[PDB]
Ligand binder design. Sequence first.
Ligand SMILES: *[C@@H]1O[C@H](CO)[C@@H](O[C@@H]2O[C@H](CO)[C@@H](O)[C@H](O)[C@H]2NC(C)=O)[C@H](O)[C@H]1NC(C)=O
Ligand SMILES: [Ca+2]
Lengths: 33, 33, 33, 214
Amino acid sequence: GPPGPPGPPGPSGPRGQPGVMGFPGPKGPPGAP
Amino acid sequence: GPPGPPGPPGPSGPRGQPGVMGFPGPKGPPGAP
Amino acid sequence: GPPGPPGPPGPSGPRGQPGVMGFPGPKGPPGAP
Amino acid sequence: PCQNHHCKHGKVCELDENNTPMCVCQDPTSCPAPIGEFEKVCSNDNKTFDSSCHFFATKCTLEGTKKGHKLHLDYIGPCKYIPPCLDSELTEFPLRMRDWLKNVLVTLYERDEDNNLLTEKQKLRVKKIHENEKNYNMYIFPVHWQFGQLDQHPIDGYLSHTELAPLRAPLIPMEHCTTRFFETCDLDNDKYIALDEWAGCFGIKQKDIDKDLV
Ligand SMILES: *[C@@H]1O[C@H](CO)[C@@H](O[C@@H]2O[C@H](CO)[C@@H](O)[C@H](O)[C@H]2NC(C)=O)[C@H](O)[C@H]1NC(C)=O
Ligand SMILES: [Ca+2]
């Protein structure tokens, strides 16, 4: 006879790529007196 | 009867991890003399 | 008939979050004498 | 026949003489070349590897050496020179990091969409910490929260050297002072850092040490 139903959904995709480096630190604090 | 067609693709994987931390900000300017 | 083979693995994850903002810049040179 | 087998860090899937999944050590040779310089890791011996994988698959098929006991994965980045932590800097330091923690926290408050990064309680200590177009009255939580994150193997109130890795490693090559700052936190030299050691290190009086913030 004719073909039977279509298999289940497959595996979850893999993890994404790592984001980019982060905004540079703020400016350092002035060398007091 | 032969086996049906393969099924949907698995739900999308998980958002990749974050990225390395940022560079230290710039050396602060000079102060009271 | 037989249910077909499981789906294929899904879509890769999205890109990650950007890293963390770096350290604040070093201290400031002590003003001129 | 393999997709459904996940092997520990360092191992991969290879089929045994019966076609039934098993786990053996990885051919370091077959890992992704560093996508940049960042992907590389340094090692106790100022000796560079191309990636995490590359260190595992090396170390994996190893064990019980004495020249290897004194060899562990030192930090992310490739192996560079690290200048000495001068006392001037090693002081100027807790004040910088703890500030950085504050930001680290705040830079999370933003990304957290449904208690995935901060609880609700915390998200509301940060709230009361953010709103400040005004100093010590902030750092308190950060420092703690940080300590929280670490002490975890096992949770006991102390910080093993291994428990620091995830902060010491990614950090050393941006802050030479890092290695120093963490050994001179362990006041009593217990080779561990206890919350007290850890709070006073960041300039936090013991009257604010609220052991519930972790
Ligand atoms: C570890 O190895 C690195 C790099 O292989 C060394 O850093 C170098 O130092 C010399 C100066 O003597 C420079 O010419 C190189 O360009 C430096 N590399 C860098 C960081 O770009 C470092 O001296 C070694 N450190 C040790 C002995 O632990
Ligand atoms: Ca612990």
